[PDB]
């Protein structure tokens, strides 16, 4: 997270950390949507160009954490993965189209003040909140700058959703309908963006209708981090809601 | 908070009915340091 700040305790209880057992390493961000399912980005699990194709036993999810490095005994819960599901039409060859994946925990986790699932949007909520100008929130333990460079505590930053035409003109990469972009424009003054290590994390918005937090997107990709004229791209979660349902109602 | 579950609790697991409400914030009617910025963005 670039140009953000330290999250408060219990501020993002659905925040999940994707972790590599050995050599121990923070791989990505993810989000807790129930006691059994975790949502993240497909490229965090699968990316052949870099020889990446993790399996259930390669990873470990850490839930309810605040500190990046220390073991938060009696606070965080560590769960094994039972199975990983990557979207069939996930395009890792070109633009990372449909960059989403689901991970089923081996044993359901218990909720607490530090562990709580986020809501996934319904058609109505997504239609009214995913508008240019509205701000969402991104969290993660990724790098603090493009070039320890890593934070000691979970970071958070609020970023404005950007008009589709502008997102399209800010890059040569083909942008699809299951993608949206966020971030401040060069002349808006404020800065901020997701960065290496934040991928897979949630882009959440608070509903003004029912006070609940909804996950509108998943940190997907960007060119560099917090560069003027560039924007972070996110997987449009509602757009891929059918695949999520399909996978879950079957396992 | 009015909310209608969408997934089958059988396969989805428990937790959806009470989703998006944080124990240390919404549940106690306490706001975090920057959520006001999000709400204002709906007006500005």
């Amino acid at each position: 997270i670039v140009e953000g700040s330290d999250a408060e305790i219990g501020m993002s209880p659905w925040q999940v950390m994707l972790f590599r057992k050995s050599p121990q390493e923070l791989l990505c961000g993810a989000s807790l949507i129930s006691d059994r399912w975790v949502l993240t980005a497909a490229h965090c699990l699968l990316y052949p160009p870099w020889d990446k194709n993790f399996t259930e036993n390669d990873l470990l999810v850490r839930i309810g954490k605040h500190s990046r490095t220390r073991y938060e005994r009696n606070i965080e819960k560590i769960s094994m993965l039972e199975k990983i599901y990557i979207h069939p039409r996930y395009n890792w060859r070109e633009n990372l189209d449909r960059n989403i994946a689901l991970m089923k925990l081996k044993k359901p986790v218990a909720f607490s003040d530090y562990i709580h699932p986020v809501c996934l949007p319904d058609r109505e909520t997504a239609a009214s909140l995913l508008q240019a100008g509205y701000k969402g929130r991104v969290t993660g333990w990724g790098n603090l700058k493009e070039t320890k460079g890593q934070p000691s505590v979970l970071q958070v930053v609020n970023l404005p959703i950007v008009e589709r035409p502008v997102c399209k003109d800010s890059t040569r990469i083909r942008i699809t309908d299951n993608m949206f972009c966020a971030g401040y424009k060069p002349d808006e003054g404020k800065r901020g963006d997701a960065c290496e290590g934040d991928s897979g994390g949630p882009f959440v918005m608070k509903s003004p209708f029912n006070n609940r937090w909804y996950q509108m997107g998943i940190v997907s990709w960007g060119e560099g981090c917090d560069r003027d004229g560039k924007y972070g791209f996110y997987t449009h979660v509602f757009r891929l809601k059918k695949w999520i349902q399909k996978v879950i109602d079957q396992f | 908070s009015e909310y209608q579950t969408f997934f089958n609790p059988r396969t989805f697991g428990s937790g959806e009915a009470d989703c998006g409400l944080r124990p240390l914030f919404e549940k106690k009617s306490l706001e975090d340091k920057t959520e006001r910025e999000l709400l204002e963005s709906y007006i500005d």
Partner: peptide, 9 residues
Amino acid sequence: NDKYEPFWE
């Protein structure tokens, strides 16, 4: 910059 308040749901 000219913004509409969300409504419904």
